[PDB]
Ligand binder design. Structure first.
Ligand SMILES: [K+]
Ligand SMILES: [K+]
Ligand SMILES: [K+]
Ligand SMILES: [K+]
Ligand SMILES: [K+]
Ligand SMILES: [K+]
Ligand SMILES: [K+]
Ligand SMILES: [K+]
Ligand SMILES: [K+]
Ligand SMILES: [Mg+2]
Ligand SMILES: [Mg+2]
Ligand SMILES: [Mg+2]
Ligand SMILES: [Mg+2]
Ligand SMILES: [Mg+2]
Ligand SMILES: [Mg+2]
Ligand SMILES: [Mg+2]
Ligand SMILES: [Mg+2]
Ligand SMILES: [Mg+2]
Ligand SMILES: [Mg+2]
Ligand SMILES: [Mg+2]
Ligand SMILES: [Mg+2]
Ligand SMILES: [Mg+2]
Ligand SMILES: [Mg+2]
Ligand SMILES: [Mg+2]
Lengths: 205, 155, 121, 70, 79, 78, 129
RNA sequence: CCGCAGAAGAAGCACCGGCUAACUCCGUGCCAGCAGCCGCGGUAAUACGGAGGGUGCAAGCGUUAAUCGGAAUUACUGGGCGUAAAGCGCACGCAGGCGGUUUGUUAAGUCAGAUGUGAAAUCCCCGGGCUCAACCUGGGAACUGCAUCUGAUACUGGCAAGC
RNA sequence: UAGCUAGUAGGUGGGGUAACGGCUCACCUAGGCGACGAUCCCUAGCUGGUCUGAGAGGAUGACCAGCCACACUGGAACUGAG
């Protein structure tokens, strides 16, 4: 119900930084990012069209930290919602509270953000929410609880998020330790490395 | 140009000694903006067969009138036993096509399409039927031209 | 067919039978082994494949494959059969479920244990 | 790791279609034996009267594999 | 006779009542003549917990329909 | 008010006629417009209708086992 | 025997276009002339004329554009063995509205576009593209 | 809801020859066995059995059964019949299906509008409520239908007169 | 499964029912149904819906709701607004 195994193995299999470590240290310094995991990982075999589709799907899942059943449901919703399914899918994932908590810079990773949420340290509009998959809406104020404002990991996580590219669709306050989910992110606001149409095709099988 | 290998088939001719094996290679190429061509190469080795196919594909490229990364109207293509159907789709549909048709439509620069392949799904004949489909497609402007009307009167 | 011919006699759908009739649309059936023996497979393959003739509760006498290395079944063993053709044995349309009723699990199996009825070491 | 066979000598009493044989063994039991793969591949012919080694199984004592012909 | 009463819907421990006109002999959640409102007993602070079509209730009372005790109380609180 | 028009196909019963009402219906599957016939036993008090006549009929109460339609008028004599 | 004069007219146009004929001629009828009028005004034929009195004959002047025939396809839809009628909301768009469907409405034979704007359904005579 | 204590009490199942995401070693030697199909195993087996590694799912995971799909493989949408399965040996002909051309008429088919009905639930849309979700729920849309009334009259049918 | 039907089909009169009616009876007429599939045989509760499907279809009718039927098996009535 969560992936609790080694993180960099996942990054190595996708062949990209999935941001599953804090990013105080470079990913190449902690692992061989170029090399896929295991004995036969130095080999780079030719990947099928299905394999390209799969590995794109698993990349997005592994970033956000979503198991297949819940991800398939996010796809069904995106297909249902009007407009571009691919863009809708990425919007839903970005909506998730664990993600939003991470992007604001309260958790160092999405897993640390997920723990904060799960451990009743986050409030949405003044009310405690401990569900990682909780969809945050525009004009919602995510905040740290007064008990959790002293947590040393939260102080550290803010300093990391200062290094990263700041989300334009959020607006955080570091002293308050609250932020406003201003709007839903556009497709332009998210990274161009994701080929979401491969996921759309994968599920259209 | 974008280039894609569709199929590689090992073929055989019997001689007095035994069997001379050789390799065929169906490829397609396109600009991803209306132009697409297929090529079929034969050689004693696979890499030579591919390169021959690519060179033939580059020189036998048709033109297709696309409407912003999709078709103008529903089209039916036929070749040999292959019968294909394609129709326009809205943005974010993706290429809903099977195997050989997808390769053609990808490199041709059709992002959104709904397709089905009836009858034989032999890659060689499917690719021809697909490209037969796309070439016989008509834009509003050329329909208006032949009918002696404006685009507004037609549409 | 002309429209008028279809009006007079519509398209008859083909009545596709079961490959596993002795189950009678049940996921398993219990039976009693009337014989337990070996049989040689069809042309390309060679082995002495372990099988049993099984009298089911519903009264169908069928042949069932006993998968895995080694088995404890004898005449008058009570077993559970599932569906599953064995390609290289004529008439063998059913597998015996291992680790159910009198049929033991396979000894010293470590992979696909759930297919051969073997507890986790 | 596999279970063990019972080797036993016998005489081929008749040949049957497709490399099948009746073989009366040492103990006097007649088994319907079939040729081994190695003997098939190497084209070792078996005939009525030939003395054969037969690998039997405890799962079935009416069947065997002819592994050697002497 | 014809009665105006609550059919219980909603979920376990979260009842939502449909205010229905029905032949009294029918099961509570069964055949009814007309729905004329709803009562949500666990409604939130700024949610319409009760709505009745008082005109349609009045019509049916006019035709000699009885009102259950709980609906009578709901008609009072609305008024 | 509500009437069917159809053709008399029997007159052999006392005070009773069989009347065929032809309908033209689109076939559900195949889309071809077919001719369908409803036969009704109809009450004919005076025994005026003969075979071939076109008659207007209306629905009434049961008059016999099979009769629940009565003659309005003869539209066309045969 | 001859049982579909309209299918015949369409076949004459189709066959005539395939054989690069300048014109095609056939026995006339009011309905043929009605369809001819739709073809002309939509610009699938150049012109038409009826000649004769007892046995009138309809001539159609076929169009060609850059050598190629303007009538790409021409299909009989409603036919004697299976009549096809459509309500205004289910009038067929041919070639995503680049072609025409010729529709017999109660206000005369017209295109599916004109039948939609009039707000009528009717019998679908033929597709033209 | 609050407090307390301590990572503490909480990970498995299938799979890795191709289809199909994932490969090596050892054992075995057409044996034992695998298998959905194609197939694999007769000494260096990525296909058997074990191991290491990997992939997929995850409080589940596999297997079996069953239905639809893919199957345009009963084809109305949407298939065929010289040689692949498929033109009756040939004709005549009743029922039936289909019907050249013009006018008038009718208004059955057809088309348009309206009215009544098409239970609620369900499905769909926009909202609301349970921390989220499932779930519950407000309103709408939909229920492609049936009947009736009023119109339209090109086409098809009826009727009449013609050619 | 190609023929089926004598209260059978209709009429008249009497009786009967809350009520129309071969519902029943007597008499009269000889009809009535059927290749637009009667009759016979086999299977089956029906529907809203449900599953699948791009759709058209196909399969299905557990739960929930409407309708029907049955209450050990075969008959029968009594009481009652039912
Ligand atoms: K969408
Ligand atoms: K073999
Ligand atoms: K067809
Ligand atoms: K007319
Ligand atoms: K009777
Ligand atoms: K009587
Ligand atoms: K149904
Ligand atoms: K009974
Ligand atoms: K009483
Ligand atoms: Mg779960
Ligand atoms: Mg009756
Ligand atoms: Mg080895
Ligand atoms: Mg089908
Ligand atoms: Mg065929
Ligand atoms: Mg032949
Ligand atoms: Mg033949
Ligand atoms: Mg002949
Ligand atoms: Mg005519
Ligand atoms: Mg009408
Ligand atoms: Mg409803
Ligand atoms: Mg007329
Ligand atoms: Mg039953
Ligand atoms: Mg389909
Ligand atoms: Mg009484």
């Amino acid at each position: 119900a969560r992936y609790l195994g080694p993180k960099l193995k996942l990054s190595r299999r996708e062949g990209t930084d999935l941001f599953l470590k804090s990013g105080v240290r470079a990913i190449d310094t902690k692992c061989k990012i170029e090399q896929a995991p295991g004995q036969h990982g130095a080999r780079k075999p030719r990947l099928s069209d299905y394999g390209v589709q799969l590995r794109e799907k698993q990349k997005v899942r592994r970033i956000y930290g979503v198991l297949e059943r819940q991800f398939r449901n996010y796809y069904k919703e995106a297909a249902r919602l009007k407009g571009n399914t691919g863009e809708n899918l990425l919007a839903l994932l970005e909506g998730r509270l664990d993600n939003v908590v991470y992007r604001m810079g309260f958790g160092a990773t999405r897993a640390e953000a997920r723990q904060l949420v799960s451990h009743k340290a986050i409030m949405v509009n003044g009310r405690v929410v401990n569900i990682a998959s909780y969809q945050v809406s525009p004009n919602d104020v995510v905040s740290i609880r007064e008990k959790a404002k002293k947590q040393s990991r939260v102080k550290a996580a803010l300093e990391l998020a200062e290094q990263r590219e700041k989300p334009t669709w959020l607006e955080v306050d570091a002293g308050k330790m609250e932020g406003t989910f201003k709007r839903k992110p556009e497709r332009s606001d998210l990274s161009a490395d994701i080929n979401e149409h491969l996921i759309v095709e994968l599920y259209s099988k | 140009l974008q280039e894609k290998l569709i199929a590689v088939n090992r073929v055989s001719k019997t001689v007095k000694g035994g069997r001379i094996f050789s390799f065929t290679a169906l490829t397609v190429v396109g600009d991803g903006n209306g132009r697409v061509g297929f090529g079929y190469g034969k050689a004693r080795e696979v890499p030579a067969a591919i390169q021959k196919a690519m060179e033939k594909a580059r020189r036998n490229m048709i033109n297709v009138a696309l409407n912003n990364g999709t078709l103008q109207h529903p089209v039916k293509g036929v070749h040999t036993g292959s019968r294909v159907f394609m129709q326009p789709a809205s943005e974010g549909t993706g290429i809903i096509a099977g195997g050989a048709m997808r390769a053609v439509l990808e490199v041709a620069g059709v992002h959104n399409v709904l397709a089905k392949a009836y009858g034989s799904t032999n890659p060689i004949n499917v690719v021809r039927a697909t490209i037969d489909g796309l070439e016989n497609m008509n834009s509003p402007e050329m329909v208006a031209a032949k009918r002696g009307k404006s685009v507004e009167e037609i549409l | 067919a002309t429209v008028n011919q279809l009006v007079r006699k519509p398209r008859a759908r083909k009545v596709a039978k079961s490959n596993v009739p002795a189950l009678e649309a049940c996921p398993q059936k219990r039976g009693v082994c009337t014989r337990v023996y070996t049989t040689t497979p069809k042309k390309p393959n060679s082995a002495l494949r372990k099988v049993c003739r099984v009298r089911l509760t519903n009264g169908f006498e069928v042949t069932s494959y006993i998968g895995g290395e080694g088995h404890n079944l004898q005449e008058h063993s009570v077993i559970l059969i599932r569906g599953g053709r064995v390609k290289d044995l004529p008439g063998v349309r059913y597998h015996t479920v291992r680790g159910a009723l009198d049929c033991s699990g396979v000894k010293d199996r470590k992979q696909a244990r759930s297919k051969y009825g073997v507890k986790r070491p | 790791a596999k279970e063990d066979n019972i080797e036993m000598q016998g005489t081929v009493l008749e040949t049957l279609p497709n490399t099948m044989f009746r073989v009366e063994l040492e103990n006097g039991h007649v088994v319907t034996a079939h040729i081994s793969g190695k003997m098939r591949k190497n084209y070792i012919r078996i005939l009525t009267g030939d003395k054969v080694t037969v690998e039997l199984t405890p799962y079935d004592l009416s069947k065997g594999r002819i592994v050697f012909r002497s | 006779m014809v009665t105006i009463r609550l059919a219980r819907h909603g979920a376990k421990k979260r009842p939502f009542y449909q205010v229905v006109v029905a032949d009294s002999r029918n099961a509570r959640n069964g055949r009814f003549i007309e729905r004329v409102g709803f009562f949500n007993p666990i409604a939130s602070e700024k949610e319409e917990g009760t709505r009745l079509d008082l005109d349609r209730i009045a019509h049916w009372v006019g035709q000699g329909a009885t009102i259950s005790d709980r609906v009578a109380a709901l008609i009072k609180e609305v008024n | 008010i509500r009437t069917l028009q159809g053709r008399v196909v029997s007159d052999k019963m006392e005070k009773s006629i069989v009347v065929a009402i032809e309908r033209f219906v689109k076939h559900p599957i195949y889309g071809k417009f077919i001719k369908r016939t409803t036969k009704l036993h109809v009450h004919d008090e005076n025994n005026e209708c003969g075979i071939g006549d076109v008659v207007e009929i209306r629905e009434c109460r049961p008059l016999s086992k099979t009769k629940s339609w009565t003659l309005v008028r003869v539209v066309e004599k045969a | 025997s001859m049982q579909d004069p309209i299918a015949d007219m369409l076949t004459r146009i189709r066959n005539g276009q395939a054989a690069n004929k300048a014109a095609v001629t056939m026995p006339s009828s009011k309905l043929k002339v009605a369809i001819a009028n739709v073809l002309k005004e939509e610009g699938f034929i150049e012109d038409f004329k009826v000649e004769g009195d007892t046995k009138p004959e309809l001539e159609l002047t076929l169009k060609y554009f850059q050598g190629k025939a303007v009538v790409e396809s021409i299909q009989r839809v409603s036919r004697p063995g299976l009549r096809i009628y459509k309500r205004k909301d289910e009038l067929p768009k041919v070639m995503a509205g680049l072609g025409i469907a010729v529709v017999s409405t109660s206000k005369g034979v017209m295109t599916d576009r004109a039948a939609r704007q009039a707000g009528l359904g009717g019998e679908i005579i033929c597709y033209v593209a």
